[PDB]
Amino acid sequence: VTREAQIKDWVENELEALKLEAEEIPSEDQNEFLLERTREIHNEAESQ
Amino acid sequence: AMAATATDKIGRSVPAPGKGILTTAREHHSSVKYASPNLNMKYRKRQLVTREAQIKDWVENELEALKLEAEEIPSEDQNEFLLERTREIHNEAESQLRAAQQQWGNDFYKRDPRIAPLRGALATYGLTIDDLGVASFHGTSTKAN
């Protein structure tokens, strides 16, 4: 239950950091960056 | 690095070789515009350094709680409680550091369908598919093989 809280926190901080990497991408083709890279954070949250 | 086994398809020829070991190079390519950060070792190492801090914290809080359980024990035979139960927190600290290493170092690619077993195996030492130097062929001197 402790370690599940830590993973919840971990996902927030990688969605904050994925917002701060999507801005530098031109907003025409940042949809396909977010689709690729939220799926990667879904996986890493599942694994943990 | 890797060691696999595969069968082939529906047939009626037991000595006929097949293509079934191709599955060691199975990966998804639908979404191959931007590089997966799970392959970057710097990233993977950053996540481990983070999780190592959390385990350091975790050990403190179980040594605070082991002090608050040793008091209620008569001080004659609390030595044998501490020996037994610091050793148990040594183990649980080791398991968690190994499990974190297993997750970012060794098995980063086992639940990523965009990384082939063959590619992941070599990526765990910073090798690329372009470093597989030599292929040792079964090479039986048969037509089919």
Added chain:
Amino acid sequence: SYINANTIETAKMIENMTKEKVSNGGVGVDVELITSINVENDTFIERNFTPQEIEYCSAQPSVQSSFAGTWSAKEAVFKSLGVKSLGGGAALKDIEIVRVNKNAPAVELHGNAKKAAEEAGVTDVKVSISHDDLQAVAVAVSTK
């Protein structure tokens, strides 16, 4: 087999803070995992260690386990004082651990860490260190 040398020291260091030595004194438990110490990196080692602790730790069998033993004592003292910050970042060079070969480790504290200790009411600062291949635990008591 089961109860190794490291479990005797860790059991003895949290048997010296189970309400006997800790009557009227702020206590400080810190562990640091061996792996998180980077010896080859010279920015971390120069700014957070004295020339007396680099000369000692470098000459030991397990250089990375000995730096993690000392680094844990500096984070055990820094908590035991009670003080939150020593101005800006963490420069724990000021808190020195003089580890004599086959001798209990001494704490001699200089600079801005000495001032906030004598101001808080701190005469002597004890510290204990057990270190091995994984964890490096450090207990400190600070009495008047």
Added chain:
Amino acid sequence: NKLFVSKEHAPYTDELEEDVYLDPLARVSKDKKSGSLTFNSKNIQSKD
């Protein structure tokens, strides 16, 4: 006397054999015509 029914064909054709082996997410679907589970080329290296 039909509990046992030999398959005559694989779920893939010899044309899709390699494309299926290489996609970890390739699954099998009821074929409208034949009524039997096969790999369709639309479900191989598919964004969905």
